[PDB]
Amino acid sequence: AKEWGYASHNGPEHWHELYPIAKGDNQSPIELHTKDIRHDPSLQPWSVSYDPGSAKTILNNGKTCRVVFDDTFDRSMLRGGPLSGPYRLRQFHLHWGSSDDHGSEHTVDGVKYAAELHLVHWNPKYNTFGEALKQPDGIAVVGIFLKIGREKGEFQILLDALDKIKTKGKEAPFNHFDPSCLFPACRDYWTYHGSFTTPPCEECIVWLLLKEPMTVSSDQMAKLRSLFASAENEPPVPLVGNWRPPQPIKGRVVRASFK
Numbered sequence: 304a305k306e307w308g309y310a311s312h313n314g315p316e317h318w319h320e321l322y323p324i325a326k327g328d329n330q331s332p333i334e335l336h337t338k339d340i341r342h343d344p345s346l347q348p349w350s351v352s353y354d355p356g357s358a359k360t361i362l363n364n365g366k367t368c369r370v371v372f373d374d375t376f377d378r379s380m381l382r383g384g385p386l387s388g389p390y391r392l393r394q395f396h397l398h399w400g401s402s403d404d405h406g407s408e409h410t411v412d413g414v415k416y417a418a419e420l421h422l423v424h425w426n427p428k429y430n431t432f433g434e435a436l437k438q439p440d441g442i443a444v445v446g447i448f449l450k451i452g453r454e455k456g457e458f459q460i461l462l463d464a465l466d467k468i469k470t471k472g473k474e475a476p477f478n479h480f481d482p483s484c485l486f487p488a489c490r491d492y493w494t495y496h497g498s499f500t501t502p503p504c505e506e507c508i509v510w511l512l513l514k515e516p517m518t519v520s521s522d523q524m525a526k527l528r529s530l531f532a533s534a535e536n537e538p539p540v541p542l543v544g545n546w547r548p549p550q551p552i553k554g555r556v557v558r559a560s561f562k
C-alpha cells in the first residue's frame with residue numbers, strides 16, 4: 304500500500320525507499336538564506352481571481368486538513384509572477400508543529416514559523432492534474448507562513464469546520480470560501496523550482512513563497528492541533544508535526560521579487 308508518515312519508522316528519512324525521487328536534486332522544502340537569494344529585476348507581480356463558490360469540501364486524510372476546490376473549468380485562477388500562463392486552484396492544506404515555536408516547512412534565515420499554508424494550482428494546458436504532475440512546471444504553489452499574533456477572523460471559518468472532520472477519512476461540505484482573504488497585504492515573494500513536500504515528491508512545482516506572514520492567535524493554532532491522524536476505529540494519535548525537514552538546495556537559485 305506504500306503507506307508513509309512523519310514518524311521514525313515511516314518518515315521523511317525512509318521515503319526514498321518508496322519513491323526514489325525523494326532523494327532527487329530538486330526537492331522541497333529548503334532553507335532560505337540571504338546568502339543565496341538573487342534579486343530578479345524581471346520578476347512581475349502575480350494576482351488571483353478566486354470564486355468563493357468553487358470551494359467544495361474539507362477533509363482529514365490523516366496527513367493534513369485539505370480544502371478541495373472545483374477545478375473542472377477555469378473558475379479560480381492564479382496568474383502572473385514567474386508563470387507562463389494562468390493556473391487553476393485545486394486545493395489548499397496546512398503543515399504545523401507540536402507547539403507554536405515551529406511548524407513551517409520552509410525556513411527563512413534560520414527561523415521557522417508556526418505553520419505553512421500551501422495553495423496548490425495546476426496548469427490547465429496539460430489537460431488533467433495527473434498529466435500536469437509529469438511536467439517540470441505543471442504545478443504552482445503559493446506558500447504562506449503563519450505567525451502568532453492577533454486572531455484572524457477569516458481563518459476561524461476553517462477552524463469551525465474541523466469538528467466535522469476530527470479523524471482520518473472524514474469529509475464534509477465546505478462552501479463559499481475565498482482563500483485570498485487569508486493573504487497578507489504585502490505581495491513580495493521568493494520563487495524557485497522544487498517538489499511536493501509529500502510522497503510521491505514529484506519535482507513539478509514552481510514555488511511562490513510570500514515574504515510577509517499571516518498572523519493567527521495561539522488559540523487558533525491549538526484548534527488545528529486538535530485533529531487526529533488516526534481513524535475512528537483506531538487508538539488516538541494527534542495530528543501534529545506534519546512537516547518535512549529542509550532538503551539540500553543543490554544547484555538552485557532562489558529569486559526574490561524585491562531588492
Ligand SMILES: *SC[C@H](NC(=O)CC[C@H](N)C(=O)O)C(=O)NCC(=O)O
Binds near residue numbers: 351
Ligand atoms: S476577502 C479577500 C479579497 N476579496 C474581496 O475583498 C472580495 C472581492 C469579491 N469580488 C467579492 O465577492 O466582493 C481578495 O480578493 N484579496 C486578494 C487581493 O489580491 O487583494
Ligand SMILES: *SC[C@H](NC(=O)CC[C@H](N)C(=O)O)C(=O)NCC(=O)O
Binds near residue numbers: 488489490491
Ligand atoms: S510589500 C508592502 C505592502 N505594500 C503593498 O502590498 C503595495 C500597496 C500598493 N499597491 C502600493 O503601494 O503599490 C504593505 O502594505 N505591507 C504592509 C505593512 O505596512 O507592513
Ligand SMILES: [Zn+2]
Binds near residue numbers: 396398421
Ligand atoms: Zn504542503
